Amino acid sequence: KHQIKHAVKKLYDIDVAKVNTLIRPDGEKKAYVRLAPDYDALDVANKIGII
Amino acid sequence: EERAGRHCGGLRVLNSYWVGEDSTYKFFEVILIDTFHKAIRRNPDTQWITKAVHKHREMRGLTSAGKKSRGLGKGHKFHLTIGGSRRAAWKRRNTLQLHRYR
Amino acid sequence: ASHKTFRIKRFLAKKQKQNRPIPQWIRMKTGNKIRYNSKRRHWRRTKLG
Amino acid sequence: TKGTSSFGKRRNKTHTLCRRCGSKAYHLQKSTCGKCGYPAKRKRKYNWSAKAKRRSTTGTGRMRHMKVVFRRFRNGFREGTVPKPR
Amino acid sequence: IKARDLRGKKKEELLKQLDDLKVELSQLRVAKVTGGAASKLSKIRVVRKSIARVLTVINQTQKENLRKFYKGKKYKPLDLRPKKTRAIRRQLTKHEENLMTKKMQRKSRLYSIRKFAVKA
RNA sequence: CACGACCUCAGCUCAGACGAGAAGACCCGCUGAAUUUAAGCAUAUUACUAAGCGGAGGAAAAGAAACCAACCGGGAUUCCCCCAGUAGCGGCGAGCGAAGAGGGAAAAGUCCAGCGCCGAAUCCCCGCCCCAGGGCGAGGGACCUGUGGCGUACG
RNA sequence: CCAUCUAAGGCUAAAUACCGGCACGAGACCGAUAGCGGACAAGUACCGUGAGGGAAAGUUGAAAAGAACUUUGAAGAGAG
RNA sequence: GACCUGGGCAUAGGGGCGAAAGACUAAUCGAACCAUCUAGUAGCUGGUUCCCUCCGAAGUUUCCCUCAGGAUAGCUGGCG
RNA sequence: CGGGCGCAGAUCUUGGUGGUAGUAGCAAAUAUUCAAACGAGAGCUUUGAAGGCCGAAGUGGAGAAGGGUUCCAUGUGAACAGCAGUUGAACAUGGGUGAGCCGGUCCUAAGGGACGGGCCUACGCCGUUCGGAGGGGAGGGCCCCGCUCGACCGAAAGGGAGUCGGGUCCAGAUCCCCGAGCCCGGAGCGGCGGAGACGGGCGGCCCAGUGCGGU
RNA sequence: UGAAAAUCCGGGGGAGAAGGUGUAAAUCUCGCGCCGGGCCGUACCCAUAUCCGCAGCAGGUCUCCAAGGUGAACAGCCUCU
RNA sequence: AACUCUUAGCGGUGGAUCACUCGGCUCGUGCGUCGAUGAAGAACGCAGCUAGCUGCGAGAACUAAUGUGAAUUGCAGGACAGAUCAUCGACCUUUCGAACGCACAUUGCGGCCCCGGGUAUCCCGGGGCCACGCCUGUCUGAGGGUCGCC
Ligand SMILES: [Mg+2]
Ligand SMILES: [Mg+2]
Ligand SMILES: [Mg+2]
Ligand SMILES: [Mg+2]
Ligand SMILES: [Mg+2]
Ligand SMILES: [Mg+2]
Ligand SMILES: [Mg+2]
Ligand SMILES: [Mg+2]
Ligand SMILES: [Mg+2]
Ligand SMILES: [Mg+2]
Ligand SMILES: [Mg+2]
Ligand SMILES: [Mg+2]
Ligand SMILES: [Mg+2]
Ligand SMILES: [Mg+2]
Ligand SMILES: [Mg+2]
Ligand SMILES: [Mg+2]
Ligand SMILES: [Mg+2]
Ligand SMILES: [Mg+2]
Ligand SMILES: [Mg+2]
Ligand SMILES: [Mg+2]
Ligand SMILES: [Mg+2]
Ligand SMILES: [Mg+2]
Ligand SMILES: [Mg+2]
Ligand SMILES: [Mg+2]
Ligand SMILES: [Mg+2]
Ligand SMILES: [Mg+2]
Ligand SMILES: [Mg+2]
Ligand SMILES: [Mg+2]
Ligand SMILES: [Mg+2]
Ligand SMILES: [Mg+2]
Ligand SMILES: [Mg+2]
Ligand SMILES: [Mg+2]
Ligand SMILES: [Mg+2]
Ligand SMILES: [Mg+2]
Ligand SMILES: [Mg+2]
Ligand SMILES: [Mg+2]
Ligand SMILES: [Mg+2]
Ligand SMILES: [Mg+2]
Ligand SMILES: [Mg+2]
Ligand SMILES: [Mg+2]
Ligand SMILES: [Mg+2]
Ligand SMILES: [Mg+2]
Ligand SMILES: [Mg+2]
Ligand SMILES: [Mg+2]
Ligand SMILES: [Zn+2]
Secondary structure, eight states, X not given: OHHHHHHHHHHSOOOEEEEEEEEOXXXXXXXXXXXXXXXXXXXXXXXXXXX | OHHHHHHOTTSEEEEEEEEEOOSSOOEEEEEEEOTTOHHHHTOGGGGGGGSGGGTTGGGTTXXXXXXXXXXXXXXXXXXXXXXXSHHHHHHHHTXXXXXXXX | OOOOOHHHHHXXXXXXXXXXXXXXXXXXXXXXXXXXXXXXXXXXXXXXX | OOSHHHHTTXXXXXXXXXXXXXXXXXXXXXXXXXXXXXXXXXXXXXXXXXXXXXXSSTTSSOOTTHHHHHHHHTTTOOOSOOOOOO | OOHHHHTTSOHHHHHHHHHHHHHHHHHHXXXXXXXXXXXXXXXXXXXXXXXXXXXXXXXXXXXXXXXXXXXXXXXXXXXXXXXXXXXXXXXXXHHHHTOOOHHHHHHHHHSSOOOOOOOO
């Protein structure tokens, strides 16, 4: 959780509230990165290309 | 000597001799050689034991104590081990030499 | 069971990703040599052990 | 009884996947693999089964490093040097 | 993205180009899940092999300095020593093989095999 | 009664090396059966095999005579041919079974301990100087409870 | 009496072996129930808790030119 | 109640375990299973693959831990 | 010239196909019916109504072991689901399991198993808190104090600090959202407050004070 | 005669620490504030069709919750969710 | 009529036969090379579309170098078209495994050093380590074991 929280702070420069890791049945770990209240996940999703 | 060479894999059993007896124990002192010490690898008169062919010579009947049990030697007493081992002689005397023209 | 080890769950993850049928373009590649995935397993008829 | 009604009471693993040979022969209570002898330092390889020896001998896997020695041997184990540049 | 063009650059320039290729591959991973484009998905392998190419130049440039730094030293790191074969590394060196005792040095000096020929 | 020498025995993630496992056709050292044959069967045979255990190398092992021989004598070892299904072994039953010579392939011989001479003339480690090959350190050790040179049955 | 050797320490190439391995050549051999279990995603699928057991399965055509289009049918499947 | 029962443990093949039935020990128990020795041996059942031509039997003798078999003589064929 | 050279048999081997045979059979646990919808197609799907059953030692609601995607949405109706199917635990395409306070993790139970030693020709075996110079930590600043000391593994039902309420999804939930907490660890200042700390005897001096109440 | 151990706590002990007249040392004050809590499991079935018995097999497979009426009843019979 | 049987044509069922063969088998020849510098084996992962096989290892369907000289191809797309292929001396080479801090039905539980960050304390991340046996040497020691000096 600390490596994922520090990775998104370096790749996208966003403060993180909490991270919830989860290993999917296909073997991939899925992270639920919750941004700080002063950061909007929609505005970051547009910058990274999700939307 | 096979028990000292097994506990010391990094050394090679050179020889062994008798130092004591008892009703229950026989005591022997085994001479082992560190085949990677420079005082031994740089002496040409003992570089033979540093070769890979002498790995665990005490476990193959090559040391003087173990070679005595093999029954080898020149003469009529040792007709069983002509050709090296007794199994080399047994394999030679039990191999059907089917020639090309026979 | 819900209680799994990481090695078992990682083992089941590989078998879950191999239980996929062959791509359609594979039959055009090898000249219809591989017609179907002969290693398809069903969760009832064949177990993993 | 001894037959059908007894197979229903089978829900306890005796063997699991071994860490050395990857086979499902690692006896749990004995803590010993039934196929490779793990955790013994030496692998069990008996001469009364040529087929069992055939399935797990050298050459049945990848040989990630031994196949490179075969390629390095045919060139004299050349090291340190590089081909002449253009 | 040419190996010959990377061997002239410095260490900080290779790391910057390595970083630029990593932010580019990350954006290609986003396009792979958002639908992307056929012209954009095929660029994934180009960026990957260019990352492998930049990362290769960095490694063999580092070891080239390491093999130069430890040259002449008595003890070299294990990865800088010749990995011929476990059996070959444990053989007598060419120095120790050429060592002759003073007895066979004299035996080879005056009792070596002569060059001769016999008529019949 | 501490301080020294030595002996014996410890500790270390000390400095630097080594061993382990795999494979195992061929090879070396052990261990070891019973089907089978004897028209039963117990010794025998199977077999100093299968399986089991240990250890190697590109080969291994063997090997330079406490040999063969009994001759006008041969001359390390290994292998081939022959000796020879012979000498012999064996409920002398079933069965088993070599060797010397002879002919060939290949051939290569040697090192110590001891004995007693040489001011330990010897070795390792460390730090170096020149060009894998040679030197140096009023550096640290090993070693006289014996290193090296000479020398080994042919004197 | 004669002959022969000098045991209880060490080394040693070459002739010799090689159903494993690496790389080749060949065949009065086998020709898909044969030949290796395996000419094919074969020690695979599959079976047994396990040690282990262990298959079946080669061939359109020179070239997919792999049957556009029309038509009946919900579709397979048909007629052209 | 000498009760029923899960999980974790222990005991392994001439061994275990048995309030004893030779019971149980993975549908296998008066000695589990797996692989190998092993293509184990069988005087005993079964089968033993094209044609035509010619000749053509024996179930009797003696011996045999033989009497469902052999040896032996006789009978048979072929070669001359 | 050389054979793996001729089959009807071997309860032969392998493969294929018959008669039986549209046959046995699709008969355990009371039950279905009407209408409508979608649809090429309906006894079997869906919806409603009706009449029934399981009757809380459920044919109900949740887990453990085991299964391993069987969960969920959509599509398909070839094959399979022993009739059918518009249905499915089938097939195809996607999606889904979020924790300091649930469990593992920590502890040792039976037990397993190293270590010392012994044994074993050996691979190894024996043995398990005993048995070795088995301590690697100090306080105090170069000095004296530490074994009742036997590794470790072994419980998702034993021991073991602390999370509950409401809401939310096609499938997640004590984990996500909101709200209200809690536990443990951490702080040369560990950030403040309070406690320690209430005053006595002499004329500034001097003496106290590591809390206090109730028999 | 019906477990061990981790862990936690109380007391005994008074070795020590603290300042010299207002404080100091010290504080087990949920008095308060500050920071952190990693890794793994987590869907679903759990049985007259998701487990085992070759299967959607009348078999086997450890638990939790459990209403109204009749009745002594967790009996049978009926009903609600 | 049907049904049954026989015969032939045709159509099925079925797979023989024949022809084919990048396979097997056997013989011969040359080499005869694993591993703590982490082997064999195993696990997991890696492709634009990829399940298996095969090839690789987070540089993951291959990097560099050399040779070669226009392709790969199922579909694209794109080649910094020196494409591709071969060679393979550089570099890289996850986890388990002799497997090595202790273990493991646990991605569990520790220790040391260093670096970076929040801020020496702690927390987070990274790097280098910590198995057993044994050899030479160093260092630190032990025992009235044998002495010397007192
Ligand atoms: Mg099932
Ligand atoms: Mg072995
Ligand atoms: Mg000399
Ligand atoms: Mg070995
Ligand atoms: Mg007999
Ligand atoms: Mg007989
Ligand atoms: Mg008998
Ligand atoms: Mg054997
Ligand atoms: Mg070798
Ligand atoms: Mg040779
Ligand atoms: Mg030799
Ligand atoms: Mg014999
Ligand atoms: Mg002779
Ligand atoms: Mg001599
Ligand atoms: Mg020798
Ligand atoms: Mg075949
Ligand atoms: Mg083959
Ligand atoms: Mg139980
Ligand atoms: Mg038995
Ligand atoms: Mg009886
Ligand atoms: Mg036969
Ligand atoms: Mg008869
Ligand atoms: Mg035949
Ligand atoms: Mg026939
Ligand atoms: Mg899915
Ligand atoms: Mg049906
Ligand atoms: Mg539908
Ligand atoms: Mg469903
Ligand atoms: Mg499916
Ligand atoms: Mg534990
Ligand atoms: Mg509990
Ligand atoms: Mg209790
Ligand atoms: Mg749910
Ligand atoms: Mg105060
Ligand atoms: Mg107190
Ligand atoms: Mg659930
Ligand atoms: Mg049932
Ligand atoms: Mg089964
Ligand atoms: Mg009632
Ligand atoms: Mg109840
Ligand atoms: Mg009632
Ligand atoms: Mg007729
Ligand atoms: Mg026909
Ligand atoms: Mg590795
Ligand atoms: Zn194993």
